[PDB]
Amino acid sequence: APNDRITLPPANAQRTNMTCHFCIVGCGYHVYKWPELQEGGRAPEQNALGLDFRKQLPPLAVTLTPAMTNVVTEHDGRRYDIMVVPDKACVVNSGLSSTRGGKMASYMYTPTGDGKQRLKAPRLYAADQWVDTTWDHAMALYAGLIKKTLDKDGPQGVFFSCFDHGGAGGGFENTWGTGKLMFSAIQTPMVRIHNRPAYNSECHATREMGIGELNNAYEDAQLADVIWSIGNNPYESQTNYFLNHWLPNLQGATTSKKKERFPNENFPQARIIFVDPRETPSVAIARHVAGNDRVLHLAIEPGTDTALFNGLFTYVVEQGWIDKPFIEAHTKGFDDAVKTNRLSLDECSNITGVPVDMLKRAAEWSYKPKASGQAPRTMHAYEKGIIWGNDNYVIQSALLDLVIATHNVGRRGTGCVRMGGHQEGYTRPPYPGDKKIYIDQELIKGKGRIMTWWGCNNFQTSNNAQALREAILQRSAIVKQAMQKARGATTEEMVDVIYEATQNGGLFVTSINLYPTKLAEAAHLMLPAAHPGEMNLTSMNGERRIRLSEKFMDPPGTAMADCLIAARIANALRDMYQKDGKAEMAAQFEGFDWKTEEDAFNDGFRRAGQPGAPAIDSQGGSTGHLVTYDRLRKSGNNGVQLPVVSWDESKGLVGTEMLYTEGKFDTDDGKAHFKPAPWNGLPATVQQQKDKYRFWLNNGRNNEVWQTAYHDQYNSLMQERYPMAYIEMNPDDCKQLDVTGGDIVEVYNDFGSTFAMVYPVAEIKRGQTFMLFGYVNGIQGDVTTDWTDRNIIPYYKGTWGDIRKVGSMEEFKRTVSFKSRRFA
């Protein structure tokens, strides 16, 4: 309650390790837990922080606020203070906390806090009202429907959209549990991923070219001469990688270390290049830190990345700023790529809009040999501006070509890497189908009997989201109406009622989640899940560093770890089949005899590539068995970078810093493969929107807001600052539409209609906008198209629309700052 003090952890308070729940960087934290009616003393040796609160602390001594504290009430009814604070000795973050990780304590479950509306028990929409139901009933209904569908339609009738990521709502236990359930037991191919509408990858091209997307260390960002940030706003989206590794390089604090590693190499002041249509907070901050002369913002025309990289590739080849020995010994296809990808600087400039002098300068900084003879160490970092860009596959083809020719993989201070989104934590059986299926289109077209959203919310985050919602709400309603007729039915009769409604266009919808979410508008069944700290969980960050987040409290009510929900489902289905005398079907549901999450770790990550093991695709590789919970605990928040190379009791886990340092790539022949990258303009579907409507509807992240705001929607500070999704608009465009900060606009096109509050931004180009994605009040995705690349990767950043004033929200004008988020 009181805003002007905090309770210090006692010197002997319990302390556990926790990786941040949220973004890829995976900053390390400590959780202090102690009884509510104890506290630490201000003297440094009388509190667990070892800090002297008897007088003012200096800058950088601590990160501690009330938002980093809480009081939990456990299953035994006893109350405990918690404090969740960053670990000063963690190599990832060196004691830094983002505004998002900083709120972890506040977003732990408590009966009266921000977590108050956590799912605590199964919820059933019994035709015309939400009620609680038992887990046994829920499993009878859910497994009963799956069983009926398997028995009559086979697996093709059972649909999922499921996380494949790490951190909270993911990780190695959870991805294995769900993957084993969906792929080995049920054996359904009707599965999409949390952020993309098929069972596919963000990185098909780079992987096929032999370069897995997480190939370096965070230390490489400290060793680089030049950093490219491509389709990426890292201060906001990978905060502490940018703050703890990128900025020290720009500031000159890593120059010593470069020169120590490389005695005979010049290291100029580091420089940074951003390829982004939009001038972001990251551009502004880079210029404040390094100066204007060390930052190059290539403010390309939306969707022109391929043309940019083809023009750069062409130029470095014509200048001879490539590594010919490297290409000759370790690559295939270079000569072909030179021809297919040829594009002059003048043509490049005309397509991208970037002037020729700036294209040449980027190449000069990045690829022209240093005075000491070596090529610059240029780390090429990319994210969703090109992963959700104009033809995912082709852009990566174009970029990786430039990288391979310039030998910017496998050398320290280089890498062509994803910056990442969530943390990573994938261990799954192979996908069981032989084709890519656009799951959302299939649902819209009326296929499937049961759909489970598991740790995602595509109502807010699908492409073409309005078409999806329309269809799902309708299909859901058919089931609701069918259930309505029933009175006094057994569970088995209800299963039959619902099954029949699905033959008539219906769809049974389950959500497995922390919260009701907007999915509750269509769901029939919701199951409560547990997040890290309420469970043990393993995951890795953007340099493959695996850590254990330790359990320290109980979940709300009967919430359960997702891997144990998957075991519960499997065991229900098994029992049903055993009882029906179907031994062969029963046996498909074996191998879920799990009592704790660690069981799922042992069954999945730790079996990969082992004798007698089934086929398992794991980020841990075949040395995953060397990792145990205990060994991770002893490693601390530093963990180990995967893959593990050895272990013994005296040296602990020893891992891998950088990939591809010996020139052996993940292809048949061990070489890196160049690929053609044709420039075909924008897709027709997108070009049609652009031809009809005025504004480029760019979209993405805000620093303060995490994802679909599942926690933030309950946070009064978050809600005061961002009550509605906002749209950055050019002020001249604003005046033309007679809107200002805190007005509400409709944004629309052929695909849909949504709303935002207007946020005038001087740095936005005329005819361009930027709307917060994924949010709880004004869903941006309504106006994204259905267009996807060859692998069903959406162009989420590729849509145009018109904007119409709704009116002036005086309350937003009184409460919300519309001041500039670009620091100068």
Partner: protein
């Protein structure tokens, strides 16, 4: 015992009419290790004090990791050089963008019409680097 509130001192800052529009005054509260600013904004804001209800005051220590922020007269914000947090002086220290999880703490001023005095009497929010606002 019996006491749930902190024992804040009452410190005179200045008289309101000495303050010029958008020209910050520096002072310490609630002790000499806690730097603060008062500023007359020039137009009324919620909870502003003085004759034009436009005077506001803050702890200038960033609530992220405690560097002293600087007041920017062009934007009426406090900017942190540490990790680029920026706070809105016209929105009770609302974080515009940054890495803090707390708004910039407001120093509560009494304005006495009788004397024209502005007195610091408390703090809304927790000042960086402290177990309690009053050490």
């Amino acid at each position: 015992a019996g006491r749930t509130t902190l024992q804040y001192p009452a410190t005179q800052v200045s008289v309101a009419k000495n303050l010029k529009a958008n020209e910050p005054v520096s002072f310490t509260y609630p002790d000499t290790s806690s730097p603060c600013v008062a500023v007359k904004l020039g137009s009324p804001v919620p909870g502003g004090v003085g004759p034009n209800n436009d005077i506001v005051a803050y702890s200038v220590l960033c609530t992220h990791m405690g560097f002293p922020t600087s007041y920017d007269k062009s934007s009426k914000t406090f900017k942190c050089p540490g990790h680029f947090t920026e706070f809105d002086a016209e929105k009770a220290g609302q974080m515009i963008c940054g890495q803090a999880t707390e708004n910039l703490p407001r120093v509560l001023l009494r304005y006495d019409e009788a004397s024209d005095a502005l007195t610091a009497v408390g703090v809304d929010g927790l000042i960086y680097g402290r177990q309690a606002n009053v050490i």
